[PDB]
């Protein structure tokens, strides 16, 4: 019928909004963490534990927005 | 230092000709000062020439 036309859609517009947002976050980050590295080697660990911290900040909404992508794409449609 | 940059001044490189440059008084009476220091450079200015090397004052 009508419904799983529109629901994908709906789907894919959330997804690719988050990974939009997700690949361009974790870039802006990455890179600001790699230059800091090839300055002070022996510094790269420290640097890396915090990138893991910061990086676990980016990926909180847009993969709440990627679960319910596949719970519309499931669970509904 | 926790990194480097790279200067002509801070690596050597094939000596082929050395300059000096020499302090001395303006003035006299100051005994054996002037051609202690004299001889001595003299000395091994002599024995870079040996190696063909020219020197500069």
Do not use: C
Not at chain 1, 4 to 12: F, N, Q, V
Not at chain 2, 23 to 30: C, F, I, P
Not at chain 2, 45 to 50: A, G, P, R, S, V
């Amino acid at each position: 019928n009508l419904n799983m036309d529109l629901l994908y859609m709906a789907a894919a517009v959330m997804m690719g909004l988050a990974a939009i947002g997700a690949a361009i976050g974790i870039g802006i980050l990455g890179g600001k963490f790699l230059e800091g590295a090839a300055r002070q080697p022996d510094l790269i660990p420290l640097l890396r534990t915090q990138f893991f911290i910061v990086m676990g900040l980016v990926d909180a909404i847009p993969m709440i927005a990627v679960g319910l992508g596949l719970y519309v794409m499931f669970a509904v449609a | 230092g926790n990194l480097e940059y790279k200067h002509p001044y801070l690596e050597d490189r094939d000596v082929k000709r050395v300059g000096y440059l020499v302090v001395s008084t303006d003035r006299g009476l100051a005994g054996g000062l002037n051609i202690n220091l004299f001889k001595k450079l003299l000395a091994e200015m002599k024995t870079w020439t040996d190696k063909g090397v020219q020197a500069d004052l």
